[PDB]
Each structure stands twice: as structure tokens, then as C-alpha cells.
Design a protein around this nucleic acid. Structure first.
Ligand SMILES: [K+]
Ligand SMILES: [K+]
Ligand SMILES: [K+]
Ligand SMILES: [K+]
Ligand SMILES: [K+]
Ligand SMILES: [K+]
Ligand SMILES: [K+]
Ligand SMILES: [K+]
Ligand SMILES: [K+]
Ligand SMILES: [K+]
Ligand SMILES: [K+]
Ligand SMILES: [K+]
Ligand SMILES: [K+]
Ligand SMILES: [K+]
Ligand SMILES: [K+]
Ligand SMILES: [K+]
Ligand SMILES: [K+]
Ligand SMILES: [K+]
Ligand SMILES: [K+]
Ligand SMILES: [K+]
Ligand SMILES: [K+]
Ligand SMILES: [K+]
Ligand SMILES: [K+]
Ligand SMILES: [Mg+2]
Ligand SMILES: [Mg+2]
Ligand SMILES: [Mg+2]
Ligand SMILES: [Mg+2]
Ligand SMILES: [Mg+2]
Ligand SMILES: [Mg+2]
Ligand SMILES: [Mg+2]
Ligand SMILES: [Mg+2]
Ligand SMILES: [Mg+2]
Ligand SMILES: [Mg+2]
Ligand SMILES: [Mg+2]
Ligand SMILES: [Mg+2]
Ligand SMILES: [Mg+2]
Ligand SMILES: [Mg+2]
Ligand SMILES: [Mg+2]
Ligand SMILES: [Mg+2]
Ligand SMILES: [Mg+2]
Ligand SMILES: [Mg+2]
Ligand SMILES: [Mg+2]
Ligand SMILES: [Mg+2]
Ligand SMILES: [Mg+2]
Ligand SMILES: [Mg+2]
Ligand SMILES: [Mg+2]
Ligand SMILES: [Mg+2]
Ligand SMILES: [Mg+2]
Ligand SMILES: [Mg+2]
Ligand SMILES: [Mg+2]
Ligand SMILES: [Mg+2]
Ligand SMILES: [Mg+2]
Ligand SMILES: [Mg+2]
Ligand SMILES: [Mg+2]
Ligand SMILES: [Mg+2]
Ligand SMILES: [Mg+2]
Ligand SMILES: [Mg+2]
Ligand SMILES: [Mg+2]
Ligand SMILES: [Mg+2]
Ligand SMILES: [Mg+2]
Ligand SMILES: [Mg+2]
Ligand SMILES: [Mg+2]
Ligand SMILES: [Mg+2]
Ligand SMILES: [Mg+2]
Ligand SMILES: [Mg+2]
Ligand SMILES: [Mg+2]
Ligand SMILES: [Mg+2]
Ligand SMILES: [Mg+2]
Ligand SMILES: [Mg+2]
Ligand SMILES: [Mg+2]
Ligand SMILES: [Mg+2]
Ligand SMILES: [Mg+2]
Ligand SMILES: [Mg+2]
Ligand SMILES: [Mg+2]
Ligand SMILES: [Mg+2]
Ligand SMILES: [Mg+2]
Ligand SMILES: [Mg+2]
Ligand SMILES: [Mg+2]
Ligand SMILES: [Mg+2]
Ligand SMILES: [Mg+2]
Ligand SMILES: [Mg+2]
Ligand SMILES: [Mg+2]
Ligand SMILES: [Mg+2]
Ligand SMILES: [Mg+2]
Ligand SMILES: [Mg+2]
Ligand SMILES: [Mg+2]
Ligand SMILES: [Mg+2]
Ligand SMILES: [Mg+2]
Ligand SMILES: [Mg+2]
Ligand SMILES: [Mg+2]
Lengths: 61, 114, 56, 118, 209, 123
RNA sequence: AGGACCGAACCGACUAAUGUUGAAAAAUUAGCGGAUGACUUGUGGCUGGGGGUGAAAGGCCAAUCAAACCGGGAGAUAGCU
RNA sequence: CACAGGUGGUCAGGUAGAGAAUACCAAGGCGCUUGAGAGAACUCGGGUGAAGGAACUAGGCAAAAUGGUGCCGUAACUUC
RNA sequence: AAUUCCUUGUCGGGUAAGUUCCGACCUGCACGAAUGGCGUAAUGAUGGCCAGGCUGUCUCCACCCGAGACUCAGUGAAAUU
RNA sequence: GAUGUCGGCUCAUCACAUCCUGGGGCUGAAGUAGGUCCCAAGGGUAUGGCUGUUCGCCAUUUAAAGUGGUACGCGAGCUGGGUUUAGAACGUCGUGAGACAGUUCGGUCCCUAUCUGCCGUGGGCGCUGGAGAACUGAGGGGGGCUGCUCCUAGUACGAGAGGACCGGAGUGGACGCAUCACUGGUGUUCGGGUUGUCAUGCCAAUGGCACUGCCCGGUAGCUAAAUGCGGAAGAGAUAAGUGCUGAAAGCAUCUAAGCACGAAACUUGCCCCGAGAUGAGUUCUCCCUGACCCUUUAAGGGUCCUGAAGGAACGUUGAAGACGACGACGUUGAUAGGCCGGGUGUGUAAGCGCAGCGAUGCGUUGAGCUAACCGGUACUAAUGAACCGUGAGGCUUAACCU
């Protein structure tokens, strides 16, 4: 369930998504949308971007 | 009843010295270290006496190595070898629990010179 | 909380089946005055067990 | 649980109970028979009979004790001058309770408590 | 094995020479007289009925008096039964003393626990109280929820609720026998046995062992 | 009867002055620790040059309690304060070299014999 | 001296509990704020409804207020129950 | 409502106390229009509590605590 | 930040452990100069955080004192159906 | 013409897709320690930091910190931090009123239980003459957890490092039952100190009120933190699994015939309830052995006489108890009170004497007082009665005496 849950529906629904990459240990989370599917999509995008930036940071170093 | 009183009288010690709350007493008790039984002395002020037959008890308070220690001895216990009154104190209460908040010169007890 | 259905006269009487009073089993008769009294109580004239206990 | 406990609260605080039994003890000494409730009489026994036992031995100390228990010198005087001498030989049980029906106003069980010799 | 009926005299301590205080319960086990012996042929099971103590003749009813008289024994304060084992055999009128427990090491003592009256859930079932402050309204020691919302739609049987506590048969098992004083008719057992002082106790040789 | 959040004094020269019990070790839902029990402590106050520093998390053995210890004959020994001896987190051997104040016979074990030996008095 | 300080009367009403078919259609108990001031209070007067009054909350205007109450248009109208 | 509410002015004893606070009293007036018992759970209003001491909880809510007079002494900062 | 979505931003402090607090940073979703900007002693039944004292708030409840609840006598409701 | 909602709290209950403990197969299983799958639901299955949080991260534990259903269980059980009205502000949008799955500070949680259900406790009748006891056990419920150390044994295994299975003992954690001997709490019913004030004419000594005025101790009882005990062993039948013998199928084959093992699961074993078990069971004992009349003439109704065993009622009461009930006792009596003695607690009463100017001290003095305790004691109250309950107990068929 997401924070600031306004209403019966929001108090009831499991809309917020958190994705953890087990090897990396990095975590992304999205609760912007009212839809678990869109939140999971945005979180997957952010997870891919964070893994990219991790390798980018290593190569820059 | 008579039954329990008999079962207790047969266990009570017959030489317990008279001590009143406020007296300084030395209690020699049996301590056993592995295989050797020796006597260890606890000397301090009697701050409480519970007269209850075989279930009689007394509390002695000493200050050992900078720390206050209280030991509640069962009077008729076979572990208490001996009790001796080294100094008779002049108090007016029966339980000197106020000594627990007093230290040094504030915890002095006048001698009962009578 | 309150009834959803009105209880019946049958149920009322069933509940009141235990509400009956009990009569005094028997009254004692004083040996001296012969007055009847509740057992272990003084009589109206002031006699208990054949002795006048309260003057009037 | 009230296991092995004695005394009746009688729907009163302790000070009220003490005052009531002081007054009622004085009344029983004065009149030698009173009409009260059965519970109150069965407690007045335990208040009053010890006072008569105290009066059996007359001393300034006992008189002062009786005054403290019953703050009235007439009652103290009666206890130590008449009642004590009267009940000298009696071991205990200086009072008797006679159940006497029920009070009209509240159906309270009533009793007469009186000194035995009266 | 058969047991004996006794009375809880009280609790005491035994001081051993090595500085140990054993908490003991003193049970006065007077002579238990056998008033009837039940057998497979007549009763379908093997057992002895025993009485102990004494009773007022004016308080012994004629039906009970006939039973005692048929046994040829004096009236006691009650009758109790003990199931006989395969080897055990007794005769009517025989008296059994506390010496029976001489070599018994552990016993089981059964008595009627002290009565606590109508007890709440906190005392009876060790329920946790709700918060004393922080806003609780008239619910500091109340039970709380007693079931679920519609499934099941009922309170289950055996739900722990407030009610009578105590005044029930309770057995404490595997208590050491500290002393068997035959001449005083006393059994000193280690620990606390159920019931108040002056209550009846059934003492049997320990079953668990 | 030491539990979590209980502040204890220190009976050794390790350099701590006040420690706090953060866990009573040795059992699930174990509530209290008495004399002879090992607890996990945090150092709340330490002397400037001591071996241990404020904020360290280590172990300790409770050596003195106000609740006291009960001897086989029913006697009780009560102290005026709750005091512990700090131990290494792994070896569970004493960190200091001196022991201050009386200790009890309950402490005597093959594990705690160093404390027993270094104690001013074993009551 | 002071829209100064502490604190009763007095005026208020920040917290909790109780009460919630109440002792009470807003209170009680324990605390709480002001307490010579932009203070508080008695008696009498004046402002009237799209009007009053409002250190402003749409607050208050007789237990009634995003337009009082009473009577009338009036049996408004009601594709709704 | 014979309702724990609201209702302006006047009078102002003693002891202690700064006091019209507060405690106990005077003059004076009252015991509050259902009682009697019992002494379970539970609710309310209080008292005390071993060892611990905010671990409670959204939050130290509530409770506990402090509390007077005289004297000593008193920090950052300051519009002094 | 009463403003920042991402976001529990990152770094430092405090804690054994701190989505809160405090000090920085600036990448200000979406600060900004009388619908005022930034400070500010004093003040506040104002919001957040920390410490000492204190404790039944809690570990974990126990006992006691009163008023109900229970029994007896008298009077005698209510919602709902 | 209203099915109250996130989280927490209290209380749970079920599923197994099992987190631990139990049993097994394979292993890239030497041992230790694991992996993976199968069987198994008996018991067990953290406390804190942050946040309204669920979640999550973190600290420190644990044998383990299971996954779920139950209106994402549970507000006529609690809370009210979040959400969700009315006040206010920031950012942003709008010319504005206003608005924001933006944020920020503040903001009323009712219900006396009729029914079912559940926890306890009675009354009635039944069980076939009545009554007092003791049982049996159909059935039902409870309980069932686990760590660490030591021995085996530094043995088996291993190059070493390390390090067992099987079996045995001890001691703990959590949980539960009982109890109060000890250690404590409480102890407004016991004793003492003390402040203000009032009263007892005054002094002396007391009492009242001030939260028990404030305190200090403390009996009984109740009680935990106190201290005893428990989980089992054993048995039966099994799960996964392991097998023996053994053909169909000249071999093979745990299976088809036959036979043996095999787990905290099941049935017992342990504890408690339990014959309304209407299928109302069993055993022991006690009591009642009169006459007459009618009718519709029978398991009929009366009349007189008789009133048993026992019960109830009443009273004194109880470590029994809301009321019932249960227990003890009622003069041939220790049931309650009182009384007597003891104990316990408090701590040296009063009065008197002495010392001191006085406060005060000392002696009489471990004094006085002392609840619920212990041991005794008929002094008081438990009244002779009365009341209910009857008079030999149906039919049929067997067996035996007859
Ligand atoms: K009346
Ligand atoms: K208008
Ligand atoms: K902004
Ligand atoms: K402007
Ligand atoms: K300005
Ligand atoms: K502030
Ligand atoms: K397993
Ligand atoms: K395996
Ligand atoms: K299971
Ligand atoms: K979250
Ligand atoms: K569940
Ligand atoms: K729902
Ligand atoms: K409901
Ligand atoms: K129904
Ligand atoms: K005890
Ligand atoms: K006690
Ligand atoms: K006085
Ligand atoms: K084969
Ligand atoms: K039967
Ligand atoms: K008696
Ligand atoms: K003296
Ligand atoms: K004297
Ligand atoms: K004495
Ligand atoms: Mg919205
Ligand atoms: Mg009725
Ligand atoms: Mg009694
Ligand atoms: Mg009343
Ligand atoms: Mg009871
Ligand atoms: Mg409320
Ligand atoms: Mg409350
Ligand atoms: Mg509900
Ligand atoms: Mg001012
Ligand atoms: Mg006024
Ligand atoms: Mg106002
Ligand atoms: Mg007020
Ligand atoms: Mg001010
Ligand atoms: Mg002021
Ligand atoms: Mg508005
Ligand atoms: Mg109005
Ligand atoms: Mg209009
Ligand atoms: Mg018209
Ligand atoms: Mg119309
Ligand atoms: Mg009135
Ligand atoms: Mg005055
Ligand atoms: Mg006043
Ligand atoms: Mg009460
Ligand atoms: Mg209360
Ligand atoms: Mg308090
Ligand atoms: Mg405490
Ligand atoms: Mg304390
Ligand atoms: Mg502290
Ligand atoms: Mg916290
Ligand atoms: Mg918490
Ligand atoms: Mg507060
Ligand atoms: Mg307070
Ligand atoms: Mg940080
Ligand atoms: Mg900041
Ligand atoms: Mg702005
Ligand atoms: Mg501008
Ligand atoms: Mg401004
Ligand atoms: Mg202001
Ligand atoms: Mg009535
Ligand atoms: Mg409807
Ligand atoms: Mg399975
Ligand atoms: Mg099962
Ligand atoms: Mg089983
Ligand atoms: Mg957590
Ligand atoms: Mg928090
Ligand atoms: Mg679902
Ligand atoms: Mg759930
Ligand atoms: Mg739900
Ligand atoms: Mg809210
Ligand atoms: Mg608004
Ligand atoms: Mg507010
Ligand atoms: Mg509610
Ligand atoms: Mg079961
Ligand atoms: Mg005792
Ligand atoms: Mg005590
Ligand atoms: Mg006290
Ligand atoms: Mg007193
Ligand atoms: Mg005078
Ligand atoms: Mg005087
Ligand atoms: Mg007065
Ligand atoms: Mg008073
Ligand atoms: Mg007064
Ligand atoms: Mg073959
Ligand atoms: Mg096991
Ligand atoms: Mg009952
Ligand atoms: Mg004494
Ligand atoms: Mg005195």
C-alpha cells in the first residue's frame, strides 16, 4: 500500500512497487500511479537505468 | 498446628544469641570451594529481624569494597555456623531500612550503653 | 442492543417460571405463650423460647 | 476473594464504620438493649465485648483507653463502675442477639442486642 | 498401585546438613480402612474402597452406617476408591498405614484446588491487559475480540472466557517423598500440593516415574 | 533482574563507567539476566584513556544485582547497585585486568574463574 | 511606570478521563490561560434579514443561519419514491 | 424536572497563613427523598508497589516528579 | 524549505540501530524581495527533535480503599419489534 | 429507507504451498556444514531504531523469527497516528470563486444484549417404589516446544584444519498447573513518628478533620519477581522410505500371494470433565409388610389410619461462593463470636519518681497495645418442634426353586 493513501480504494490496494536487484543490492521504487502495472513498469525502467549508471560509473572510474 | 510445630521445634537451633535491630554482628557461615569447607565472616549492622520460629531470619548490611551488601540469613539454617554480637546499637525502630540512603558519618548508630 | 423480533407471551411465561415466591415452610409455636412465630425469631409479644425477652 | 478475612464493610468507609460503632457501643452501654440490623449487631458484639473486658480491671490507663475507644465519660464510668463489676465472673459473651423480624421501610433483617444480665 | 487418603496439615521446611532447605508439605495419612473390595466377577473391575478419619454418629446416615457395619469398620469422613493392580490383594477391614509409601520415591498428590470464584480472563487464562492509558475507553481488562467477522459467524467452543476458577480436582505429579514418619502418621513431600490446609489429598505412587 | 534499557555500572578497569543492556542473550523472549548471565551491552560513558570507547557494542557478565541471588538454604545476597564485567565479543573473556567490588559464588565457573581470581571478595 | 511579573475573586477554555437513552440538547473532575486592561460586569438604549453586526470563523442575529422566525401566495412544482 | 448548569449587589469572626489561597473551627446552616445486605468478573474514582526506568505510544498521553522563604550563585545571546 | 516530485537525494552530527531532527550541499519538479526577501532578543495551553529528573506508560501485572455491577424490599423506563 | 476503512492493540481460528524440531531419497554427500526433492501441521515460530505506516532497511538475538485464508479475521472489543468534512498556510493551476494520488499545522469513534453463539452456574422433570453413597466409562477437552554443556570421543572421517552418527547424563529459555515454606509486594481492619487546627473545663493523656493529613514499619489473606511439578518413556497401526522371499515375464522384480521395519503426524499411554451415554449403565447399604368404601371397574378413584429411610427449611457459618450451588456444625455442640493462653507486629504505653532552667533524657520497662494466626474454653448464639417425602413397588416371557 502506498503512502498518503486517500480513500477506501487507496487504503486497500497494493499499488506501490519496489524492485531489488539481488546481486547488485540496488533498489528502485515507484508509487506515482494508481496502477500497480504502470508503477512496476516505471520501477523496471529505473532499475535498468541504475544498473546502467553503475557500470557507467565503473567505466568512468 | 501441633504437628508442624513439633516438626519445627525438632529442627530449631538452641543457642541463637540475642540480637536486636541495630547491633553489629559477625555471622560465620560455611562456604564450600570444591572439596574444602571453610568459614567466612560477614560483619555488619542488623537492619531487620523476622521472628517466625524455624522460619526466623535476619538481614545484615555491610559496605564491602565500596559497595553496600545485604545478606538475609535464615537463623536456623545449618549453613550459619555462628552469630556473635560485636557491638550493641541504640535505635528506636525495628527495621532500619533508612540506613540504605545514608552513608559514612550519616549512617552512624549510637551504642546502647545499657 | 435490542430485539430484532418481539418475544412472545410463551417466552415471557417461560422466563417467569422461576419467579415464584416460596411460602414459609412452617411457623414455630412458643412453648409459653403458644404464639406462632418465625423460627429463631422473637414472637410479637416478645417471647423467645418461652422467656419474655423484650418487655412489650 | 475474601479468604480468611474478618470485618464487614457495611457499605461504609472505615472512618464512618468506626464512628458508627463508637456511637452504637455507647448506646448499648447506656440503654442496655438496642434494636439494630442483624449484621450491625453481629459486629457490635466484636466492638463492645472487648470494652467490657477492659473495664473488668480498673486503672487510670484502662479508663483512658476506654475513653479513646468511646469518647464519652458517662459510658466509661458505667463500664468501669457497674458493667465491669457485673460481668466480673463471666468469661465472655456479655451480649445476646435476638432476631426480631424485618424493618418496614426497607425489609432489613432486624435484631435486638442486649447485655445478658439486664 | 494403591494410594492413601490424607490431610494437608500445612507447609514447612526441612534443613539438610549440607545447607539446603527443602520446602515440604506435611500430609497426615491416618490409617485407611478397607470398607469394600470390588472384583471382576461382581463389579467388573478390581478396586478397594477405603475410609479414613472419624465421623459423628449423629451425622452418619443409616444407609452409610449399614455399609460401614457390613465392612466391620468404624465410620470415616468419606469413602474413596483405588484401582487394584494385578498382584495387589486386600481384605475388607484391613487397615493400611503410611508405611506403604516407605520405599516409594516419587508420589502424585491430587486435591481440590483453592477456589478463586468468578475470575476474569487476565487471572484465569493469563490474557494480556489492554493499555491503561493512551486513550483506552472502559476496556483495560476486558477480553477483546472473541471471533471473526462472518466466517465463522459464531464463537468457537472452548473459547477462553471468564468464569469459575479453582475448586476443581488437580493432580501434581512426581513429588519427592522426603520423609515417611509412621509413628506420627505423617508424609512429608517436597513441594506444594493442591488444596488449602485441612483438605483431603489422594497420594498415589507416581505413574510417570 | 537486568533487562533491555537497564543501565549498569562496570566492575573492571576496562575504562567504561556506564553501560546499557541491549539484549539478554541465551534464549528466545528471555526477559531478565541475573548474576552469572551474559548480556549484550553498549558503552554509554567511558574514561578518556580506557581500552573501550563510548558507543562500542560488546558483551558483559552481570556480577552484582539489586534483586540479588538466592542461596540453597533460602538466604539472599542483595547489592546496592547493578554491576557487570565487560567481556570480549568473541572470546567472552574479561577485557580489563582488575575487578572492583565484591562478586558472588554464582560467578564461579570454568569460564568466569578469571573474574573470581581477580575479585576483591567472593561473597 | 507598565495592553509589566506571580497568584484568588472574576473572565476564559489548552489536555485527559467520565458522561454520550447524560446530573447537563455542551457539563463534571484533575490540571490549563488572562487576571489594571485592546479587562470584566449590572441596568437601559440603538442597528432587522439580502438586512444588521463581525480584531473575519461564513462567525453571530432567542438550543434556528451560504440568508432568522411567523403568517400568506400555497394544495409552488416534483418526467422522482 | 424538587435538574451536579446559569444568576448582579451587600456583610466578612478565630487559629495558622502574604492572602477574600488553603486546613481546622465560630455565628449560623445542613447530611444532599430510596434503603438493607454482600464483598465475584468487569467499569469508575483513589492508595501502594520488588527489579527495571519510555523498552510504551503516532506522540512521555496519562501518571510520577518539581513546588516556600532567606542567602550564595547563575550561560549563550540581547532590542541592554 | 509549512515550498523538493524523484526522495528515506548525498555528506556530516546525534543513536547499537534515526523515512523524523540538526548542520551542509544546490540537481530550486515548482523560493524570492511590502499577496514582501533574509535575520532577529523577548514572548507562545504553537509544530518537530534531543537530554536529565521522574515514574504501573511499559516488561507484567499484584494487592488494597471507596462508588456501581450481584442479592433482598419499594418505585419503575428505553430504543427496537 | 447506510454491509464503518489503513495500521496498531486484545483475542484468535483454520490451510499447507513446512520456517524450526521429526522421518526419508539423491548429491558435484569424506567429516562438520550444506544443496535439492519426498513424508510430516504435534508443539514452537524475537525485541528494538526510523516512519501513521503495511512494506522495507537497519541493530542485536533465536532452534526458528513460515507462507496464507478467515468481510486482506476481529471499532454493538479498544485506539484514531494515516485516511475522510468544516479553520489556516506553502508550492502549483486558474482572471476568480476555487482546485491538487502535492504538502503542512488543528480538528466529537454512541448503543443498558432480545435471539443465536460462547464461558460459567442453578432450577425442573426423567431414568418406572423411595433414599444415601461409591463407581464404570460411551464420549469430550487439556497437554505435546526447544537450547546449551559434559560423556561416548578428540573416537569414526580427514593430508591437515576441523570433527561426527548412534546412545547417555546434567542444566537452561519460553509456556502451563499448583502453592505461599522461603524471598518480596500489598496489607485505609495492628503498632509507632509527626504538621496544622478543633474538641474532650484545664494540665497531662486522647479523639475528630486535613488523600489512610503526611509518613515509617507490619499480621492474616491474596499474590510474583518467589518455588515445586509437567511436556515424556512405552505400545499399536502407518506416511515418505528401506527391505526379505517371490512369480506373472526360465532373468529380473519390495508385490501380484506371503513376510519385516519405518516419524513430533494417527490410536493409546499422562491430566481433567463425563450415565440427559433417553442406549439414562454397575456395585454397596438403608426404609416402608394397615383397614375400608365406591365407580365407567382399571397401571381407577376415594375414606380413615399411618408419615419411614431421607430430604428440605431454619440458625451458626466456611481458604465455598455474584445469587444459586458445594462443605462444616446445631447443646449427645468447638459452627461463629466472645474469652483465655501463646505467637506476631510495632517498639520501652500511661502514671509516678529522678536529672535538667527548659526542650528533653533516664528508671519503672522490651513496656504498652496488638486484625484476619495458633492451642484451648459452652460465656453468647446455633429451640422442642413443624414441613416434604409413604404404606412392599406394572405387564409379558424365560430360567430356577416351585
Ligand atoms: K420504603
Ligand atoms: K433573507
Ligand atoms: K516549490
Ligand atoms: K498586494
Ligand atoms: K521586514
Ligand atoms: K519553539
Ligand atoms: K525438517
Ligand atoms: K537431506
Ligand atoms: K505443525
Ligand atoms: K514504504
Ligand atoms: K493468521
Ligand atoms: K469489509
Ligand atoms: K456488528
Ligand atoms: K437468531
Ligand atoms: K509468601
Ligand atoms: K504478606
Ligand atoms: K490532633
Ligand atoms: K527379489
Ligand atoms: K444413571
Ligand atoms: K470460638
Ligand atoms: K522511659
Ligand atoms: K512510661
Ligand atoms: K512486644
Ligand atoms: Mg482528493
Ligand atoms: Mg427471574
Ligand atoms: Mg474467619
Ligand atoms: Mg447500597
Ligand atoms: Mg474462595
Ligand atoms: Mg468517550
Ligand atoms: Mg479508563
Ligand atoms: Mg464487529
Ligand atoms: Mg499583566
Ligand atoms: Mg458571574
Ligand atoms: Mg470564545
Ligand atoms: Mg476546571
Ligand atoms: Mg503571562
Ligand atoms: Mg496571572
Ligand atoms: Mg471557508
Ligand atoms: Mg443560535
Ligand atoms: Mg435566498
Ligand atoms: Mg399560485
Ligand atoms: Mg404539495
Ligand atoms: Mg433532590
Ligand atoms: Mg479567615
Ligand atoms: Mg475557601
Ligand atoms: Mg470493590
Ligand atoms: Mg482502578
Ligand atoms: Mg500513586
Ligand atoms: Mg515499581
Ligand atoms: Mg524501587
Ligand atoms: Mg534513573
Ligand atoms: Mg520507542
Ligand atoms: Mg514499539
Ligand atoms: Mg502531561
Ligand atoms: Mg500529579
Ligand atoms: Mg544520516
Ligand atoms: Mg536542515
Ligand atoms: Mg511566497
Ligand atoms: Mg509583490
Ligand atoms: Mg510575512
Ligand atoms: Mg496569548
Ligand atoms: Mg428490585
Ligand atoms: Mg434497512
Ligand atoms: Mg506436504
Ligand atoms: Mg491434526
Ligand atoms: Mg499424538
Ligand atoms: Mg520491525
Ligand atoms: Mg516514532
Ligand atoms: Mg483476498
Ligand atoms: Mg491479516
Ligand atoms: Mg480487515
Ligand atoms: Mg487523525
Ligand atoms: Mg478549507
Ligand atoms: Mg488543539
Ligand atoms: Mg466504542
Ligand atoms: Mg487435543
Ligand atoms: Mg504463612
Ligand atoms: Mg514485607
Ligand atoms: Mg502501608
Ligand atoms: Mg495509625
Ligand atoms: Mg477547650
Ligand atoms: Mg495539651
Ligand atoms: Mg469535627
Ligand atoms: Mg480521614
Ligand atoms: Mg470541616
Ligand atoms: Mg525370482
Ligand atoms: Mg519433544
Ligand atoms: Mg458454584
Ligand atoms: Mg514481638
Ligand atoms: Mg501513643
Amino acid at each position: 500500500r502506498t503512502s498518503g493513501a486517500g480513500g477506501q480504494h487507496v487504503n486497500r490496494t497494493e499499488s506501490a512497487v519496489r524492485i531489488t536487484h539481488i546481486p547488485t543490492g540496488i533498489v528502485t521504487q515507484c508509487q506515482n500511479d494508481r496502477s500497480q502495472h504502470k508503477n512496476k513498469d516505471q520501477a523496471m525502467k529505473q532499475m535498468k537505468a541504475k544498473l546502467y549508471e553503475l557500470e557507467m560509473q565503473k567505466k568512468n572510474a | 498446628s501441633n504437628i508442624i510445630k513439633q516438626l519445627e521445634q525438632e529442627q530449631m537451633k538452641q543457642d541463637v544469641p540475642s540480637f536486636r535491630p541495630g547491633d553489629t554482628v559477625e555471622v560465620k557461615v560455611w562456604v564450600v570451594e570444591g572439596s574444602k569447607k571453610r568459614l567466612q565472616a560477614f560483619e555488619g549492622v542488623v537492619i531487620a529481624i523476622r521472628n517466625r520460629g524455624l522460619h526466623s531470619a535476619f538481614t545484615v548490611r555491610k559496605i564491602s569494597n565500596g559497595e553496600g551488601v545485604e545478606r538475609v540469613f535464615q537463623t536456623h539454617s545449618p549453613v550459619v555456623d555462628s552469630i556473635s554480637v560485636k557491638r550493641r546499637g541504640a535505635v528506636r525502630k525495628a527495621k532500619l531500612y533508612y540506613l540504605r540512603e545514608r552513608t559514612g558519618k550519616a549512617a552512624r548508630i549510637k551504642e546502647r550503653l545499657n | 442492543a435490542v430485539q430484532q423480533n418481539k418475544p412472545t407471551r410463551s417466552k415471557r411465561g417461560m422466563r417467569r417460571s422461576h419467579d415464584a415466591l416460596t411460602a414459609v415452610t412452617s411457623l414455630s409455636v412458643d412453648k409459653t405463650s403458644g404464639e406462632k412465630h418465625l423460627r429463631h425469631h422473637i414472637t410479637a409479644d416478645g417471647y423467645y423460647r418461652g422467656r419474655k425477652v423484650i418487655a412489650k | 476473594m475474601r479468604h480468611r478475612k474478618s470485618g464487614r464493610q457495611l457499605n461504609r468507609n472505615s472512618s464512618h464504620r468506626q464512628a458508627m460503632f463508637r456511637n452504637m457501643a455507647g448506646s448499648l452501654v447506656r440503654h442496655e438493649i438496642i434494636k439494630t440490623t442483624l449484621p450491625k449487631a453481629k459486629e457490635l458484639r466484636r466492638v463492645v465485648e472487648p470494652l467490657i473486658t477492659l473495664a473488668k480491671t480498673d486503672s487510670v490507663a484502662n479508663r483512658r483507653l476506654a475513653f479513646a475507644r468511646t469518647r464519652d465519660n458517662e459510658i466509661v464510668a458505667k463500664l468501669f463502675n457497674e458493667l465491669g463489676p457485673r460481668f466480673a465472673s463471666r468469661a465472655g459473651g456479655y451480649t445476646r442477639i435476638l432476631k426480631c423480624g424485618f424493618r418496614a421501610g426497607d425489609n432489613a433483617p432486624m435484631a435486638y442486642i442486649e447485655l445478658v444480665d439486664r | 498401585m494403591i494410594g492413601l487418603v490424607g490431610k494437608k496439615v500445612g507447609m514447612t521446611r526441612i534443613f539438610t546438613e549440607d545447607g539446603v532447605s527443602i520446602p515440604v508439605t506435611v500430609i497426615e495419612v491416618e490409617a485407611n480402612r478397607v470398607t469394600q473390595v470390588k472384583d471382576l466377577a461382581n463389579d467388573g473391575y478390581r478396586a478397594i474402597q477405603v475410609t479414613t478419619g472419624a465421623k459423628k454418629a449423629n451425622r452418619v446416615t443409616k444407609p452409610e452406617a449399614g455399609h460401614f457395619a457390613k465392612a466391620g469398620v468404624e465410620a470415616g469422613r468419606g469413602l474413596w476408591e483405588f484401582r487394584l493392580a494385578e498382584g495387589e490383594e486386600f481384605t475388607v477391614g484391613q487397615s493400611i498405614s503410611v508405611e506403604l509409601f516407605a520405599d516409594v520415591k516419587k508420589v502424585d498428590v491430587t486435591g481440590t484446588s483453592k477456589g478463586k470464584g468468578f475470575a476474569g480472563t487476565v487471572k484465569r487464562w493469563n490474557f494480556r491487559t489492554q493499555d491503561a492509558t493512551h486513550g483506552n475507553s472502559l476496556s483495560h481488562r476486558v477480553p477483546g475480540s472473541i471471533g471473526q467477522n462472518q466466517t465463522p459467524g459464531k464463537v468457537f467452543k472452548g473459547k477462553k472466557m471468564a468464569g469459575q476458577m479453582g475448586n476443581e480436582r488437580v493432580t501434581v505429579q512426581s513429588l519427592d517423598v522426603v520423609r515417611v514418619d509412621a509413628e506420627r502418621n505423617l508424609l512429608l513431600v517436597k513441594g506444594a500440593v493442591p488444596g488449602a490446609t485441612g483438605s483431603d489429598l489422594i497420594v498415589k505412587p507416581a505413574v510417570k516415574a | 533482574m537486568i533487562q533491555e534499557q537497564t543501565m549498569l555500572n562496570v566492575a573492571d578497569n576496562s575504562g567504561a563507567r556506564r553501560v546499557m543492556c541491549i539484549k539478554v542473550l541465551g534464549g528466545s523472549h528471555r526477559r531478565y539476566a541475573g548474576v552469572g548471565d551474559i548480556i549484550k551491552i553498549t558503552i554509554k560513558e567511558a574514561i578518556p584513556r580506557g581500552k573501550v570507547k563510548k558507543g562500542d557494542v560488546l558483551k558483559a557478565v552481570v556480577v552484582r544485582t539489586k534483586k540479588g541471588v538466592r542461596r540453597p538454604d533460602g538466604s539472599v545476597i542483595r547489592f546496592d547497585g547493578n554491576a557487570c564485567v565487560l567481556l570480549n565479543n568473541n572470546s567472552e573473556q574479561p577485557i580489563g585486568t582488575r575487578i572492583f567490588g565484591p562478586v558472588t559464588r554464582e560467578l564461579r565457573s570454568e569460564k568466569f574463574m578469571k573474574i573470581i581470581s581477580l575479585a576483591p571478595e567472593v561473597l
